[PDB]
Design a binder for these strands. Structure first.
Ligand SMILES: [Zn+2]
Ligand SMILES: [Zn+2]
Ligand SMILES: [Zn+2]
Length: 87
DNA sequence: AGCGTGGGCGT
DNA sequence: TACGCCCACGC
């Protein structure tokens, strides 16, 4: 069940926990509570701030597993796309 | 390619 | 609630 309904104009989204609704509603309000301390860009979410910060350090914790391919990536989804490309 | 960001789901 | 994962879409 998903009783936490979004009531913004024309929106039908519904969620199972209050914070999931709150997270979603930032897409309507444009509120960005989290700020990068390196470049001062602001973000709606702390998880997306965290992956953003890897753009400044070069940290790429996700490594391709194909032999003789040295490629690494900042996020899991970039590695999925890459592994899909090797086939 | 690299990464913003919206949403599912977890602890 | 804080914090964060994964996946998917769109530049
Ligand atoms: Zn909404
Ligand atoms: Zn930054
Ligand atoms: Zn590879």
């Amino acid at each position: 069940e998903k009783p936490y309904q979004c009531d913004f104009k024309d929106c039908e989204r519904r969620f199972s926990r209050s914070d999931r609704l709150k997270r979603h509603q930032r897409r309507h309000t444009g509120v960005k509570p989290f700020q990068c301390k390196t470049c001062q860009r602001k973000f709606s979410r702390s998880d997306h701030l965290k992956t953003h910060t890897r753009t400044h350090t070069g940290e790429k914790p996700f490594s391709c597993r194909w032999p003789s391919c040295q490629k690494k990536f900042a996020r899991s989804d970039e590695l999925v796309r890459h592994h899909n490309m090797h086939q």
